[PDB]
């Protein structure tokens, strides 16, 4: 009797430190307006001393739970898509569920850079539909602690945020997730990478500091690959839902880079004016950007029944995905 | 038309270094037979220098694909449950799918300690039944590079392995995953932990080497909490599937500790003779244990149609789960 899922509540959260382009442009010896011109970012939020991923996730999640007016017993599963868990062990999701008082909820972390939220959304939808119970989906990242301040290509982009969606079970068809496409291309695995800390190079006393920090080895190759993945996944979820770009009420791409957002919009023939854009104030927080944008646009104009959303993302891996969701 | 998933193929792999109890006992200044008395482990496999998580996972994955006689184009999604990815970024799953030639497969890492494979299995079953496409589920860990060699409670248990299962879409009902129950208990989050490395304490020059390695802070408390979670999840999936333990053909618990496996069997009324037990040769490899045991038990005696499998695990988090699968 459950045939679909709906986004019943939305939330998002950022740390308090607001970091303008001008502060970063000073550190990197760049003139004024350099960052905004090349990325569309004007400011971003960065975590401060102590700030935890789970505490950030918790605030977005609590906001989404309260928005859904759902009792906390109703959450059967908590999916936390993150690249930056509190600890390498255990995963952060069980602590997130505990801090939200979700006493009947399972919990697991998903590592998909971003593409993590779209993967988590798709699998959560399949859970909601298979078991007929609600799932909380949170995406959150503290990328600021992974930024190599000397690497301009990354230092000007990445930001910290959390977004959350509550998925509840629905009895009716031809709504909810109409189509979904999840791709991966490991030929680009080394383009966005942290050298040290996995099992391939465990962290050791006296290792090179920067080996713990993100690097983007070829910013232009990544741009081209990411645009192709978001374009191609979007085109085929549209084809599978039997829609065109003209039927999408709101386009919510991963907020990698405004120039990249524009490129995808062009490739798909989607007006700039239908595209949710939050990178300007929140930067690129990887898997958090799409649920943060959904929280933002829903606050600005509540999502109305019959609206169709197109969500797409691409990330390190490489990974990519798209989802057509109908309110 | 798809109404269930079937485990169409199995695989497992381990590294080449065999570590007898005697070598670790000497290390810890322990009398002979100490480890086997208390854990039932006789030996375990550890990684050698240059071995990689993704390479280990690939060997298990390929054995599972070949056992399934499945064309690589059919794999639409690769789920890698690991705590020990090659790199902190990107996830290891896209590389694994790339090295296995799965050119149509998405890919994402799940981090669930363990419980990771049972979460992976549950969500993949939802994917299979929702989209009608095959999924490769791998669980793999190289815990040895995270072992604190001085900590007796963890150094004698943990091991390296990979296990893999090909889930294919099946038209018929009343088989496959009959019930699943996924739980989390974050009040025990600190019991099994790595201090440094996540976003809470990022890795730094000059930091205490110890902080990069696992610690189990209260083994007795872990033992009780994990036994309870495996017992309680197992009872409720049996109740949901309207089966008794006597209907279960093979019981396949997470291989944490033979004494813990004995305690769960004892609570549930399950014969030692029905329990798959691989911990004696393969140790505790977290999420890899259950699919490794499934591949072992299937090699010894092919899973026959009609057989009913009870799977259960608990882990750091706390996390836990149970699955009833009918062949
Ligand atoms: C566009 C992108 C490169 C972002 O980085 P960026 O803001 O452009 O930063 P860059 O320094 O690389 O931009 C190019 C700049 O370097 C300069 N530059 C680089 N190589 C140069 C060269 N060989 N000669 C001259 N100038 C060069 C460019 O000309 C330009 O600076 P300048 O005009 O002042 O000389 C892109 O990779 C991106 O946005 N990726 C998204 C991050 C991510 O992973 N998101 C997840 C989804 S993809
Ligand atoms: C059983 C468990 C405690 C670890 O295994 P273990 O080898 O039995 O751990 P211990 O070393 O504490 O066993 C008792 C021993 O510790 C010794 N010990 C520990 N602290 C001691 C102390 N303060 N004083 C005296 N002895 C002490 C006991 O005397 C006994 O040692 P001895 O027989 O040589 O004298 C348990 O935590 C476990 O196995 N957990 C599973 C691992 C896991 O996380 N699996 C994933 C699913 S949970």
Q: What is the DSSP string of B143-175?
A: GGGG--TT-HHHHTTB-EEEEEEEEEEE--SS-
| Sign of the torsion formed by the C-alpha atoms of A74, A79, A84 and A86 | positive
CB atoms within 10 A of CB B49: 6
Structure-determination approach: X-ray
- Ligand 1: lining residues by beta carbon, under 6 Å: A 38-39, 152-153, 156-157, 192, 219-220, 222-223, 226, 254, 256-257, 260, 284, 314-315
As beta bridge partners, residue A4 has A170
Contact A222, A314 (CB under 8 A): no
- For chain B, which domains are there? 4-113+115-170 (3.40.47.10), 176-326 (3.40.47.10)
Q: Which residues of A208-227 are buried (b: 16+ CB within 10 A; e: fewer)?
A: eeebbbbbbeeeeebbebbb
User: What's the gap between Cα B288 and its chain centre?
Assistant: 3
Contact A307, A276 (CB under 8 A): no
Contact B143, B84 (CB under 8 A): yes
Q: Report the 3 state secondary structure along A307-326.
A: CEEEEEEEECCCEEEEEEEE
As beta bridge partners, residue B252 has B311
B110 to A115: CB separation less than 8 angstroms, yes or no: no
CA atoms of B68 and A98, how far apart (whole Å): 39
User: What's the gap between Cα B31 and its chain centre?
Assistant: 30
CA atoms of B175 and B28, how far apart (whole Å): 48
Contact A106, A131 (CB under 8 A): no
CA atoms of B301 and B310, how far apart (whole Å): 16
| Sign of the torsion formed by the C-alpha atoms of B183, B187, B192 and B198 | positive
| Sign of the torsion formed by the C-alpha atoms of B296, B300, B302 and B303 | negative
- Ligand 2: lining residues by beta carbon, under 6 Å: B 38-39, 152-153, 156-157, 192, 216, 219-220, 222-223, 226, 254, 256-257, 284, 314-315
CA atoms of B186 and A326, how far apart (whole Å): 34
CA atoms of A72 and A69, how far apart (whole Å): 9
**H helix or E strand, kind and range, residue A61:** helix A53-68
Report resolution (Å) to 1 decimal: 2.2
Q: Which residues of B255-265 are buried (b: 16+ CB within 10 A; e: fewer)?
A: bbbbebbbbbb
Strands annotated E in A203-272: 215-216, 250-253
With CA atoms as reference, report the closest residue to B214 among B155, B146, B261, B159.
Answer: B146
| Pairing between β-strand B43-46 and β-strand B17-20 as defined by DSSP bridges | antiparallel
Residue appearing with tokens 């995953």: B177
CA atoms of A124 and A117, how far apart (whole Å): 10
Contact B58, B96 (CB under 8 A): yes
CA atoms of B47 and A200, how far apart (whole Å): 11
User: Which ligand has the minimum distance to the alpha carbon of residue A229?
Assistant: 1
Minimum distance, in Å, between the CA of residue B102 and any CA atom of chain A: 9
| Phi-psi group of B47: left, alpha or beta (phi > 0 → left; psi -120 to 50 → alpha; rest → beta) | beta
Tokens of A319: 């990974």
Secondary structure class of B201 (helix, strand, coil)? coil
Dihedral of the alpha carbons of B49, B54, B56, B62, in degrees to the nearest 10: -150
CA atoms of B73 and B60, how far apart (whole Å): 18
CA atoms of B158 and B24, how far apart (whole Å): 11
| Pairing between β-strand B176-184 and β-strand B319-326 as defined by DSSP bridges | antiparallel
CA atoms of B189 and B79, how far apart (whole Å): 24
| Pairing between β-strand A308-315 and β-strand A250-253 as defined by DSSP bridges | parallel
């Amino acid at each position: 009797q459950t045939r679909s899922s709906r986004m019943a509540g939305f939330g998002h959260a950022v740390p308090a430190r607001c970091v303008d382009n001008a502060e970063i442009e000073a550190s990197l010896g760049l003139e004024a307006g350099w960052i905004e011109r090349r990325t569309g970012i004007r400011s971003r939020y960065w975590a401060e001393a102590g700030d935890t991923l789970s505490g950030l996730a918790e605030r977005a999640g609590r906001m989404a739970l309260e928005d859904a007016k759902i009792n906390a017993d109703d959450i059967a599963l908590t999916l936390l898509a993150t690249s930056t868990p509190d600890h390498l062990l255990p995963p952060s999701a069980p602590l997130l569920a505990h801090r939200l008082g979700l006493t009947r909820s399972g919990a697991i972390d998903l590592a998909g850079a971003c593409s993590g939220f779209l993967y988590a959304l798709t699998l959560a939808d399949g859970f909601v539909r298979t078991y007929g119970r609600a799932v909380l989906v949170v995406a959150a990242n503290i990328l600021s602690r992974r930024i190599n301040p000397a690497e301009r290509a990354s230092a000007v982009l990445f930001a910290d945020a959390a977004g959350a969606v509550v998925l509840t079970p629905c009895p009716e068809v031809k709504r909810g997730v109409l189509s979904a496409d999840l791709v991966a291309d490991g030929s680009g695995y080394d383009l966005i990478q942290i050298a040290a800390g996995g099992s391939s190079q465990p962290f050791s006393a006296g290792m090179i500091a920067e080996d713990a920090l993100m690097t983007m080895r070829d910013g232009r190759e990544v741009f081209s690959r990411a645009v192709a993945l978001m374009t191609n996944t979007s085109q085929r979820v549209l084809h599978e839902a039997e829609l065109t770009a003209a039927d999408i009420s709101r386009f919510v791409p991963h907020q990698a880079n405004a120039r990249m957002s524009d490129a995808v919009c062009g490739n798909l023939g989607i007006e700039r004016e239908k595209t949710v854009r939050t990178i300007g104030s929140f930067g690129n927080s990887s898997a958090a950007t799409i649920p943060l944008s959904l929280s933002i646009t829903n606050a600005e104009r509540p999502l109305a029944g019959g609206e169709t959303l197109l969500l797409t993302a691409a990330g390190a891996g490489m990974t990519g995905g798209a989802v057509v969701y109908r309110v």
